[PDB]
Chains A and B, each alone.
Chain A
Amino acid sequence: PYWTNTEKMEKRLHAVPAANTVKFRCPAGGNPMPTMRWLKNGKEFKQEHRIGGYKVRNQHWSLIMESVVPSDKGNYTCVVENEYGSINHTYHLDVVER
């Protein structure tokens, strides 16, 4: 598997205002079509890890978090795996206030 747009995938620092939505993408291809899982600060990102939970759209390779709160701060990492290899990218999320 391989990043489709490796130049956008160099971006790592993301800041977003509270109570809005953060969206992270990691688009890929890889024979056979790889699957994607998400990590938060190293650990597996699971639905109960934040209040709203999180939504996905695999078909557009994206993790989504609505209503962000200062505790959503941290590192988010997409893992893309097929039978033949795993690729790895981290975004860093910051939350702005007022």
Chain B
Amino acid sequence: DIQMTQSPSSLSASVGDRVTITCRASQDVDTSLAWYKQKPGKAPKLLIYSASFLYSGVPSRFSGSGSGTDFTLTISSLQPEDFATYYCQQSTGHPQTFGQGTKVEIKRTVAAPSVFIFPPSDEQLKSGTASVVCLLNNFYPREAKVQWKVDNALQSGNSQESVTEQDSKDSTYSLSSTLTLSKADYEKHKVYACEVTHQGLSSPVTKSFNRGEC
């Protein structure tokens, strides 16, 4: 096929920044190239077609250039609503192909997570399973490390994380980590603790509870 390669894959830029995203095709596509913007949960929106034509309603701070096998999408002054994933797409007679996408995140000052820990409800304990939830609230950057400790034993393989999209107001992320145990294991042990590593933390903060004293 005609393979499209976007670079970079992801980027962090401040508001007002100039952003360049490049798209290379594995063979000549002339100027038959389109750029899409997509916010999470919504349809892609066309920005540019035929390499350099700005689509109706698309702000003039977006511009497109290139030909042959090299193309660039330029954002002259990055605004807060321009934070999304950008796709190129070649539109030759060859079957249509897209680039893998370039995700644009917002840069802001470092902010520490507020950490909370939640023990399994007693309702859930009736079912044969315990969920322990650890909440990292309103932090930046997204990079974070969560370590579960059950009676100071490190856990591996029994947790799942989920991260919110970047907040529109304060550009922070929130994360949840969920530790899943059989009721039987949960009752074999006393100390449930969540250890959080983050740039905004001089030292790892540990939030914890004792099974029962709640």
Contacts and interface: CB of A to CB of B under 8 A. Distances in A.
- State yes or no: do A and B touch (Cβ within 8 Å): yes
Contacts, number: 6
A60 B53 contact: no
B138 interface: no
Contact of A55 (B31, B53, B67): B53
Assign chain B's interface to a size class: under 10
A83 B52 CA distance: 30
Interface residues of A, number: 3
A6 B118 CA distance: 76
B65 to A, nearest CB: 10
A57 interface: yes
Contacts of A55: 53
Nearest to A57: B52
Interface string A29-53: 0000000000000000000000000
- Summarize B's interface: helix, strand, loop or mixed: loop
B93 to A, nearest CB: 15
Contacts of B31: 57, 60
A57 B31 CA distance: 11
Nearest to A55: B53
Interface in B22-56: 31, 50, 52-53
A60 B68 CA distance: 12
A20 B47 CA distance: 18
A48 B184 CA distance: 80
Contacts of A60: 31, 67
Contacts of A57: 31, 50, 52
A60 B31 CA distance: 9
A57 B52 CA distance: 9
A55 B31 CA distance: 15
A57 B54 CA distance: 13
A90 to B, nearest CB: 24
A55 B51 CA distance: 14
6 contacts: A55-B53, A57-B31, A57-B50, A57-B52, A60-B31, A60-B67
Closest 4 CB pairs of A and B: A60-B31, A57-B52, A55-B53, A60-B67
